Amino acid sequence: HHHMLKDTYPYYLANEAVYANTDLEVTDKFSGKVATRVALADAQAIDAAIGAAVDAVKPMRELPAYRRQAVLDHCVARFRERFDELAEALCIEAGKPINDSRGEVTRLIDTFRVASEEAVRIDGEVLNLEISARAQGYTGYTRRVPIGPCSFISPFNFPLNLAAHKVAPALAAGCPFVLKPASRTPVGALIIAEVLAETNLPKGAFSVLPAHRDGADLFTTDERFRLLSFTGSPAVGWALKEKAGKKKVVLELGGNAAAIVDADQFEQLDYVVDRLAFGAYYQSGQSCIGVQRILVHASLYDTLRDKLVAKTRSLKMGDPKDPSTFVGPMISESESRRLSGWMDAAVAAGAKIIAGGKVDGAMFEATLLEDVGREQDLYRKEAFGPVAILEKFDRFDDALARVNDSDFGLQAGVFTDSLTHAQRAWDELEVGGVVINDVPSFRVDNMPYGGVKDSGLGREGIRYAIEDMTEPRLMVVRRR
Amino acid sequence: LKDTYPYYLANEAVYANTDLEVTDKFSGKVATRVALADAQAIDAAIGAAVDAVKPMRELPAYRRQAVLDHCVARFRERFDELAEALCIEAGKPINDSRGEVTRLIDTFRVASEEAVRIDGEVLNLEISARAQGYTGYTRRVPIGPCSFISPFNFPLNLAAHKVAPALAAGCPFVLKPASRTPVGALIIAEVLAETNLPKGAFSVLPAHRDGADLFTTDERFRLLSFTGSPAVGWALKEKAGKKKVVLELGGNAAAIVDADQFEQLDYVVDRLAFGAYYQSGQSCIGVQRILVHASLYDTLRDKLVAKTRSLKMGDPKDPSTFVGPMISESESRRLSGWMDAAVAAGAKIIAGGKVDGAMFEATLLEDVGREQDLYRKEAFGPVAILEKFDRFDDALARVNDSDFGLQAGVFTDSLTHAQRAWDELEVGGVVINDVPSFRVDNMPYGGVKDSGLGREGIRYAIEDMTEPRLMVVRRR
Amino acid sequence: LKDTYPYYLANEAVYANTDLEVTDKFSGKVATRVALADAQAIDAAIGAAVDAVKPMRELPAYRRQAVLDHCVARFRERFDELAEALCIEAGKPINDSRGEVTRLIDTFRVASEEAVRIDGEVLNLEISARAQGYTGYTRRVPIGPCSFISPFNFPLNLAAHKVAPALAAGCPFVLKPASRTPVGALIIAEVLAETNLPKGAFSVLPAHRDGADLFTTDERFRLLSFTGSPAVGWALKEKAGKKKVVLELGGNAAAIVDADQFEQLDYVVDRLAFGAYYQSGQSCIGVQRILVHASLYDTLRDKLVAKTRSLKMGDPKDPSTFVGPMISESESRRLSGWMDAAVAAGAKIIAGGKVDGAMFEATLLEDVGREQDLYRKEAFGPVAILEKFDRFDDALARVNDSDFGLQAGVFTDSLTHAQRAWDELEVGGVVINDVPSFRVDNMPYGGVKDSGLGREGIRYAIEDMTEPRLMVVRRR
Amino acid sequence: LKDTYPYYLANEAVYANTDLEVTDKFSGKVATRVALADAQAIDAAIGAAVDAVKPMRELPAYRRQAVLDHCVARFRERFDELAEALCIEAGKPINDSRGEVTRLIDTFRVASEEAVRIDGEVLNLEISARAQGYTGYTRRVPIGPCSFISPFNFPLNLAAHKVAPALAAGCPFVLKPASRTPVGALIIAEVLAETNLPKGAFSVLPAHRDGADLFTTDERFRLLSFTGSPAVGWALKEKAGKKKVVLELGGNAAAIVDADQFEQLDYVVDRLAFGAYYQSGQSCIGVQRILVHASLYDTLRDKLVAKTRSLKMGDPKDPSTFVGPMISESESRRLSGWMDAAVAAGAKIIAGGKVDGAMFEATLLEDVGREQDLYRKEAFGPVAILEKFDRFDDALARVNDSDFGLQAGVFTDSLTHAQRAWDELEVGGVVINDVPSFRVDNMPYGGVKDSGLGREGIRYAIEDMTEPRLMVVRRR
Numbered sequence A: 001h002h003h004m005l006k007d008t009y010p011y012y013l014a015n016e017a018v019y020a021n022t023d024l025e026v027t028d029k030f031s032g033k034v035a036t037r038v039a040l041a042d043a044q045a046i047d048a049a050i051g052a053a054v055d056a057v058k059p060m061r062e063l064p065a066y067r068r069q070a071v072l073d074h075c076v077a078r079f080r081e082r083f084d085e086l087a088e089a090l091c092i093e094a095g096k097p098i099n100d101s102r103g104e105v106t107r108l109i110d111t112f113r114v115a116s117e118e119a120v121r122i123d124g125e126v127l128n129l130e131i132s133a134r135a136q137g138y139t140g141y142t143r144r145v146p147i148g149p150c151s152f153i154s155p156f157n158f159p160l161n162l163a164a165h166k167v168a169p170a171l172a173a174g175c176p177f178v179l180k181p182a183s184r185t186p187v188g189a190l191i192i193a194e195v196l197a198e199t200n201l202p203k204g205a206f207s208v209l210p211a212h213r214d215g216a217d218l219f220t221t222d223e224r225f226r227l228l229s230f231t232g233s234p235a236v237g238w239a240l241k242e243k244a245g246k247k248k249v250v251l252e253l254g255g256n257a258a259a260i261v262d263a264d265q266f267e268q269l270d271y272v273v274d275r276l277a278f279g280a281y282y283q284s285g286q287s288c289i290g291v292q293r294i295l296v297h298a299s300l301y302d303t304l305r306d307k308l309v310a311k312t313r314s315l316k317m318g319d320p321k322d323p324s325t326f327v328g329p330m331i332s333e334s335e336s337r338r339l340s341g342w343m344d345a346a347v348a349a350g351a352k353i354i355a356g357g358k359v360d361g362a363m364f365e366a367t368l369l370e371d372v373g374r375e376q377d378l379y380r381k382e383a384f385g386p387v388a389i390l391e392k393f394d395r396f397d398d399a400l401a402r403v404n405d406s407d408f409g410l411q412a413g414v415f416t417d418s419l420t421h422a423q424r425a426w427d428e429l430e431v432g433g434v435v436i437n438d439v440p441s442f443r444v445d446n447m448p449y450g451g452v453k454d455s456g457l458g459r460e461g462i463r464y465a466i467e468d469m470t471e472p473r474l475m476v477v478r479r480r
Numbered sequence B, C, D: 001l002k003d004t005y006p007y008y009l010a011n012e013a014v015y016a017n018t019d020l021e022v023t024d025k026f027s028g029k030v031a032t033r034v035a036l037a038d039a040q041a042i043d044a045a046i047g048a049a050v051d052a053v054k055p056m057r058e059l060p061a062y063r064r065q066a067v068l069d070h071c072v073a074r075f076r077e078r079f080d081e082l083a084e085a086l087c088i089e090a091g092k093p094i095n096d097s098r099g100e101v102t103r104l105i106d107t108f109r110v111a112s113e114e115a116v117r118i119d120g121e122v123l124n125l126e127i128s129a130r131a132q133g134y135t136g137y138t139r140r141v142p143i144g145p146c147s148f149i150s151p152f153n154f155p156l157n158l159a160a161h162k163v164a165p166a167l168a169a170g171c172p173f174v175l176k177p178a179s180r181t182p183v184g185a186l187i188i189a190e191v192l193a194e195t196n197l198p199k200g201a202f203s204v205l206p207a208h209r210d211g212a213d214l215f216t217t218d219e220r221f222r223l224l225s226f227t228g229s230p231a232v233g234w235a236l237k238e239k240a241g242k243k244k245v246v247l248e249l250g251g252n253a254a255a256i257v258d259a260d261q262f263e264q265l266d267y268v269v270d271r272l273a274f275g276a277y278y279q280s281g282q283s284c285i286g287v288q289r290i291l292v293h294a295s296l297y298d299t300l301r302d303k304l305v306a307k308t309r310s311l312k313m314g315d316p317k318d319p320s321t322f323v324g325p326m327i328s329e330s331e332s333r334r335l336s337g338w339m340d341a342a343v344a345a346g347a348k349i350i351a352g353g354k355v356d357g358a359m360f361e362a363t364l365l366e367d368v369g370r371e372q373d374l375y376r377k378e379a380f381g382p383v384a385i386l387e388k389f390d391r392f393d394d395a396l397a398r399v400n401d402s403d404f405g406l407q408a409g410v411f412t413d414s415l416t417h418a419q420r421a422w423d424e425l426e427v428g429g430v431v432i433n434d435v436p437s438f439r440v441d442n443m444p445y446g447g448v449k450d451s452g453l454g455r456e457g458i459r460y461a462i463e464d465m466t467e468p469r470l471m472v473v474r475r476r
């Protein structure tokens, strides 16, 4: 350990640091103390950033692929150099257990490395257009042109890697961008910005501007932005789509992800239980694909329940700086009170707490319930905390229907060795991604990732983000 | 035309009323009457589309293909009927109407081919030790019920660019054609009704814009795909709610004639006259602005004035007619007013200029200021403007001097200039050695800036009408 | 059958002689006589193919498609003629002959679709400062004249897998069908002669192997694509010279029945009988070896013995015949000799076993030693061997215990076992939940080890029948 | 250079002997001595490769990438050592030796990128009712042990174009470098020996052609990939047996200068001189023939004569040297004999023309008859021929007037002419606005006609070093 968190941070306006004020206090989410103060961007700074992004469109578009790759490679190298600094910043400002903070910094590097690879292979097509006599002598050629200035909004819980899934493809694609990180967790994004400020990018290629939601209207409504890409809560995301105007909108939202445990899993129950506990309680359940609902075949239910109760009770809660901590604080006392209120309501309606259940401020222990009615808020809304619900099924198709019994559809997991059941799940689960033999909580950063129903609109993963951040431009050549 | 047409509700002909009168756009007389859908019928169609989602999703690729092949065969069989219906209800010259029916067949044939090759990917996910043992598999799943809205000017082929990919992708859909030209869509519906598609796979429902709110707002639709005016399309995007939105809109397309074109001027002029005046300029990629290098401007002008004056205006049923009626006297009046204002501000009519009701002759102007409505707004009529340039980059800048960006054309033999145009023209498509008005129905097609959001062409519409669904398999 | 057939030399029928007698493979009587091409005719065909290279290359994609579509339509109209000819000259049961004609049509249909989507790539080449300003563009150019050799058992469809992609790719070709079954190829040629292909686009020339050296050695062919026995194919590769060589050969295909299959044994047994005995085992992916988990062996054995005994042997013109004659008495003698040797070494015939001329009953043995010719060589007749395993990995190793590697089948519901089989089976294709005998005509298809070199299936044949041609453009 | 180098047998350095002397190609003195592999060592290497097939196949993609990344990092650290070794053993001017080390790194970097994206396809197989319920999944499986042979002139980068894709694809390989230039390959081997690759993943074995039969004939190799002279490559294809063969050979590359190039002549002349005389013309895409439009022939000739005469010849250790020694006096004598014959038949030397041992001046000739050896065979030395044309199609015909077809270059700004050249030049690659001598290491690269069979460039080499393995899954 060597402490590198600064007492103050600037924001980044058109690639350069501005120590405009110290008005945004960032707390340590475990101690509650102010850990650092960062510059808060007002609407004039946001407007200036957008104008600079417009001016950077042509210089960014003209940057050759290998230069964009070199920028991304510089980031990769510097993130590796500053690995412990990034991990500690994440631990402090998100209250994220240090082991898992280190894991997210590894993902940040992974995401930029995928972007570095994809930056030099944004290919096009030579299209046969001679499909009829009228088109004799015509040929098509395609390319992907950067869409223009992009507006990026990211959430508190994976602040490094979810910013990376917008920033890194934008650089690969050649788009200027303005990123607004979560005000509770801005420091990681500002370290990313400091690293980018070391590169030769054209001025206006990027701004990173902390701003509260109530001062952030221009990120959605300014017509100079050609894309809004938002990662955050469904309630916010769908509201911003309505206000976005002409720009393209990409939404990465939330859900109440389910895992199914099939009848053939007896011999690997310890593996299953370990992955269920990871998915339900990693980062205290503050994951957009955290396991919230667990559907277990009746033949295995009692044995799995005993094992999962024991595993859940074994998880260490406490200071996220402690490398033995698995369950750190929830992001605020108000979020803990929201979830504990839903838990109380489920219990009042007949549910039973079978592991955990103690809440002390933002310290919510890993908690497991059964007999939760499907009508309950704890069942149907996004828990976003260290609570999971255990339920029983007989017929695989009933398990699938109950996974789908939701407003949401981000990912689902199925522990099965049956080809028939895996195929049926792929056919029938209305989700962005179906995970076989692991929890829905799995993501690798090159894969297409996103939700359907109320959980999203579009996909991230570097290739898919590049597609959204570019416009195809066809050239038709006529030969006579 | 038949005396009356039904609408199609969940694959079924319903003779609900005869309330929508469709006029012959040349004679002005009522040519047919068709059933007008009310909100109850639209709601029932949407509910039926929801119930058809699973049966459509389960329809095998080769059966979706067979449905598309049946349409192709019947459109060939009914070619003259379709072309004459187009001629009547759109006032479209019969030669151009036949051209559109040929394209209707082309569009469905591309869809037939694409229906059986909606492939996915086996993705390497082992990019780090954490992901050892994981593999990805992808497929495209139908997005769900689709809402389709189409315009008056290509009533068969632009409906086809939504209907045919929806069938290939496995989506139920509800199509609202233009009230001025609904018969083509209703003949497409009649042919689809012959097939064994599951009930609720399709509805085709005439409705006026003021009775069509549910096509935009109903949350059971997962996609709205709109083809029509920019003013309407951007307004509907604001009201669509959660659904995906695809927009195919309009523009003021330009053609550049480079300094190396002197020996090809007769070809260039023929294509300019085609692009500016085909279907009386009622094309979303009609040539509206012509930028010509100063070195050959005067020769091109003489030839283009002569060509424009040679174009025959009159009854669209006459095969010799090139310029038929505009869609209404009010649209002709709108364009004539813009022309008058440009002349009042200093422009000069150098060919044509006579307007009589909806009969607007092929017209060419010079000295149109770039601030004029005739320059900047979508003319959608048989008027083109001619202007001069010296430097190629100035021509490119002036093409881009617009709210719009659908397609642009560049007549050049210079690799350097073609490459520069591809780099710099902010449009969906750049056409080299033909006008921007060229489209072949498999190509990616659409606009940027105020001209659109997304692409049509069968492959690209299938992408919008499906959701990727990843399956990650972990081996331990 | 007509009394005589011509051969086709540079698109035209030539009734050169009646020197090749084609027998009815069930009655033994001469059914027709066809013209036999000598080396002078083969040489002339090659020269004509060279002269047709440029006109074939300049044929637009939609014209190549139209040629293929004409074949599809005419094969449909001549369906019964084609099936009856195949039934007579191959002794193929009429139901399976009709099934092959359907495949012939489907193979040409896939080629028709692919003919208009032979796309290329726009490649980013700016991977370093040295390559700043360079871009790559690719296309596929026809490779040139192609030499095609096809076998007796699927004479229509295996010719189609060379002819149809050649037409889609723009290659002139010269096809030598099997002398035992040349008529189907000559009907295909007659249909092609109705199209307006440039003269020299195709020749179809019956010739015996000992008069066929030019098909391998002539340097004017740029590709030899051979479907036939491994002994011949590997020997032709050695003699081919500079040309590209594609080989589609044979094997001793295996099916594994996993421990989880008890509830679907009737399905498994039905597919095993189909794969082992369809066309009397005269299939390059016929089931020859059946490995069954010990826990299910006795139940499957009883069901498979009963199923095998139920198969009707006899006249292939009878639609109830499943087991028709083998292609000749000499081939029946070959297989009967291997069967006798296996029994002498301890094997047991548990169903069938009677041989009378070319009429070889559907036959099942157990206790066949892995050293036996019946185990290790290509049976190509209505014999299958049944063996037992305990460990899934042992089953996989025993599938691989072979010179060959075309396809293998695994009946399993285990993801773990399906994945392991995909990892470990050294074959071109692994079929899960069906026999190795399955093929659909768009899929990549071929062998590794001694079973082949390269892949057919339309897309993959087009790749072999074309050369990529890169255009690098430098901007500075 | 070190005093001695070992060879690498199954990943390990073996100082077996010092029997292969490597000379400094400028001084002629022995610069180092390396271990020469005999048949026993080659056979041991092949057996070890066979044993490494399964461990190499099971290496996860990210581990193969890490191996490649280790190579990139160490090549950067050892950049000067690699460049000096190449300068000495090939006589390659130090500036250009440094350039080839940069290419070595670039080639491994492309391979590192491609190693983690060897994706497959999820194929729709439901193209007919018979195939209802079937789906296809593909993967690329390493082909097995690969035999690699590389030439003297780009010994680092051409070894890299085999070694790096083999590692990305998961194939064990045995590489035989050119005996005249083995040190660079042995440094690559030393770096690979630092990685944790399974034993038998690689061997690098110097051996003379007369002791190298097993590299072509041993049946345990599944692929021979040969880069070298056409006379050798086509001969090895005849002897290869069943294995797949890939050939990267030579040619007599041409550059066309079109009529529109007057304002660019200094750029054109600089690139022509570079392409003709880089590494003293010892390049498989060196410019040998220069076709110039009559309208600017005299001006180009004057400029190219002056540029050619300005090139500095001498010690390749001097950074100012561009024309170093040819690889041997025997090769110099070969080319000077062809030059003498051309002059005796009427050609004129207009620049250079003098030869002193292996020091052959940059030399330009006119009036070389198309029949001459200097015109038609591969010069592989610092000689270029200048000729005149009036019609672009005639220039294209004359480029094609050759046994060869690797790459051609065309300096033109005409879209029409660039398209015609892409249509008509029978070469692997057409370069627009640069010489045929351009290559970037990700692009598809290779020859047609006598110049090659197949393509290198990382993606394309991976395709040849893998077999597709289809998994068909049936759902009922």
Ligand SMILES: NC(=O)C1=CN([C@@H]2O[C@H](COP(=O)(O)OP(=O)(O)OC[C@H]3O[C@@H](n4cnc5c(N)ncnc54)[C@H](OP(=O)(O)O)[C@@H]3O)[C@@H](O)[C@H]2O)C=CC1
Binding pocket: B149, B150, B151, B152, B153, B154, B158, B176, B177, B178, B179, B180, B207, B208, B209, B210, B212, B213, B215, B216, B227, B228, B229, B230, B232, B233, B236, B247, B248, B249, B250, B251, B283, B284, B285, B378, B380, B446, B452
């Ligand atoms: N990008 C493309 O592919 C093309 C685009 N176009 C564009 O189409 C326009 C010309 O067509 P036009 O028919 O006049 O266009 P409109 O925008 O006037 O109408 C198009 C369609 O939208 C419907 N519509 C209009 N307002 C609403 C509303 N509030 N809610 C629901 N539906 C509504 C119309 O209904 P109704 O008329 O029945 O009331 C009609 O079906 C031009 O701008 C042209 O560029 C044309 C061809 C090609």
Ligand SMILES: NC(=O)C1=CN([C@@H]2O[C@H](COP(=O)(O)OP(=O)(O)OC[C@H]3O[C@@H](n4cnc5c(N)ncnc54)[C@H](OP(=O)(O)O)[C@@H]3O)[C@@H](O)[C@H]2O)C=CC1
Binding pocket: C149, C150, C151, C152, C153, C154, C158, C176, C177, C178, C179, C180, C207, C208, C209, C210, C212, C213, C215, C216, C227, C228, C229, C230, C232, C233, C236, C248, C249, C250, C251, C283, C284, C285, C378, C380, C446, C452
């Ligand atoms: N991979 C695949 O797609 C398939 C492969 N096969 C394989 O085909 C074989 C059965 O067919 P079959 O006809 O008996 O095979 P053969 O190898 O006996 O004959 C195949 C073709 O090759 C010709 N031929 C044989 N020797 C030569 C030669 N020296 N030069 C030129 N041509 C020659 C034959 O001519 P002719 O007979 O006229 O003398 C015939 O046209 C089996 O091994 C089977 O596995 C079958 C079907 C599918």
Ligand SMILES: [Mg+2]
Binding pocket: A001, A002, A003, A004, A088
């Ligand atoms: Mg600290």
